[PDB]
């Protein structure tokens, strides 16, 4: 068989007390109607405005949208990377407009919920500040029974999940994230459950924890590194914020800024025009430099660029930003073609001055193999399924022809001549 327990089980209780000591339940009767109201509200706001898209997430080889539609708010700048796409913070007041209103009402949940944290990790350790500095929120939506049909939970017979089990990822080690429910209106297969397992464990049963309307739940320290967790679906929908704390080291536009900028010392800098040259082709420069620019274009542009017409619906925060990172990178071929430009020099000698090729084809190749990967995703058969407003674009993108550039969106030519040397 395979088992599991909730509240209508003895066992439960002291299932929960000795072997998820780290799991805590707030329920509703804990918190503000005023900020009970508010959150609900501004799950509707948002929802109104269609600011919760599913994701067109490329896990494991293949393509897949997500049954769950979201959102991700939280500190201006900040990133949050959830199974290979990097969602950008639609922003709130860290020190169109019902928008703005939410993140709002959103920051002041994560406030409070950021002192609850503080509070039962004292009562617990009976570090901590900072391992409750959530800095961004993941919203999420499901249902009306859209799904087909939906997946059996495999292992505890625990019937139909939203999201099967999982670690949330890419946060700071040994950091806590707390978590909004809010359902609007074994275990009752129509109320929304979270469910608990110990990693790799299978045997040991499981756990099912109902979720009511404006229900908390909290994975304090390694909690969420030691267990799995999934979400069995209710009847009717759900809304969640889930709040954590990214590790956004390499993750905000401060950092890929600055990034630039250092890739930007090598070049002569008097005035912005297509005559760019470098002050050195020391190969570990170049290395850095042609890095950097794969960095910003994969992981900030074509990611960004792959959500498309998706944030503007919510906020403008990231248009100023994202066009100055294009500036940044068209410069960056500049540079790639100017070191192209070097190799294939009638001086040098192009014998032993040739570690300039074993300091930048690795970083080229990458650029290949990736700028397909993104090609292939944008125009694949499910990317036209996806709404107009939707769809995801595959930016930067120029002709052979389109003259501006000083190079190709690539094919490979290039990648086989340098092999060739
Ligand atoms: N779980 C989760 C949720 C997001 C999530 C985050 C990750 O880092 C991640 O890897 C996955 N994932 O692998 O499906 C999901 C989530 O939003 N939830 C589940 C609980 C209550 O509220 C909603
Ligand atoms: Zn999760």
């Known amino acids: 068989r395979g088992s599991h327990m909730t509240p209508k089980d003895d066992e439960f209780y002291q299932q929960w007390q000795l072997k998820y000591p780290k799991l805590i339940l707030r329920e509703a009767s804990s918190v503000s109607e005023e900020l009970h109201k508010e959150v609900q509200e501004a799950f509707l706001t948002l929802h109104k405005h269609g600011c919760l898209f599913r994701d067109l997430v490329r ?34 007041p860290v020190k169109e407009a019902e928008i703005a209103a939410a993140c709002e009402t959103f920051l002041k949940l994560n406030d409070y919920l950021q002192i609850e944290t503080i509070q039962a990790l ?37 019937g139909k999940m939203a999201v099967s089990w999982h670690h949330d990822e890419n946060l700071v080690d040994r950091s806590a994230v707390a978590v909004y ?89 008097d005035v912005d025009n297509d005559d760019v040259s470098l002050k050195s082709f020391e190969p570990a420069v170049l290395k850095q430099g ?48 100017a070191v192209l430009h070097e ?21 080229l190749t990458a650029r290949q193999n990736l700028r397909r990967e993104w090609h292939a995703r944008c125009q694949s058969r499910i990317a036209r399924t996806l709404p107009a407003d939707q769809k995801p674009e595959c930016r930067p993108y120029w002709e052979k022809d389109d003259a501006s550039m000083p190079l190709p969106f690539d094919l490979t030519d290039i990648v086989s001549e340098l092999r060739g040397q």
């Not at 896990?59 to 969602?87: F, H």
């Not at 570090?127 to 939906?150: C, E, G, H, W």
């Open 122 to 158: 004292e009562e617990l350790a009976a570090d901590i500040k900072s391992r409750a500095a959530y800095n961004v929120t993941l919203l999420n939506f499901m249902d009306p029974q859209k799904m087909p049909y939906l997946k059996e939970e495999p292992y505890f017979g625990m």
């Open 343 to 363: 190799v294939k020099r009638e001086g040098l000698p192009v014998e032993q001055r040739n570690e300039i090729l074993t300091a930048i084809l690795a970083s």
């Open 290 to 337: 042609e890095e950097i620019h794969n960095e910003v274009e994969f992981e900030w542009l074509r990611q960004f660029w792959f959500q498309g017409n998706r944030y503007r619906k919510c906020t403008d925060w990231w248009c100023q930003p994202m066009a100055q990172l294009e500036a940044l990178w068209k410069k960056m071929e500049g540079v790639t073609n």
């Open 181 to 269: 429910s809010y359902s609007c209106e074994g275990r009752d297969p129509d109320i929304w459950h979270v469910g608990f397992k110990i990693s790799w464990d299978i045997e040991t049963p499981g756990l099912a924890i109902p979720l009511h309307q404006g229900d908390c739940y909290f994975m304090l320290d390694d909690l969420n590194a030691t267990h799995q967790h999934c979400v069995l679906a209710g009847s009717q929908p759900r809304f969640s914020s889930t709040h954590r704390v990214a590790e956004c080291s390499t993750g905000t536009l401060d950092y890929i800024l600055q990034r630039c900028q250092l890739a930007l010392q090598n070049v002569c800098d």
């Open 59 to 92: 896990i494991q080889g293949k393509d897949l949208l997500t049954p769950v539609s979201r959102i991700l708010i939280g500190n201006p700048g900040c990133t949050y990377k959830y199974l290979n796409t990097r969602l950008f913070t639609v922003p709130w």
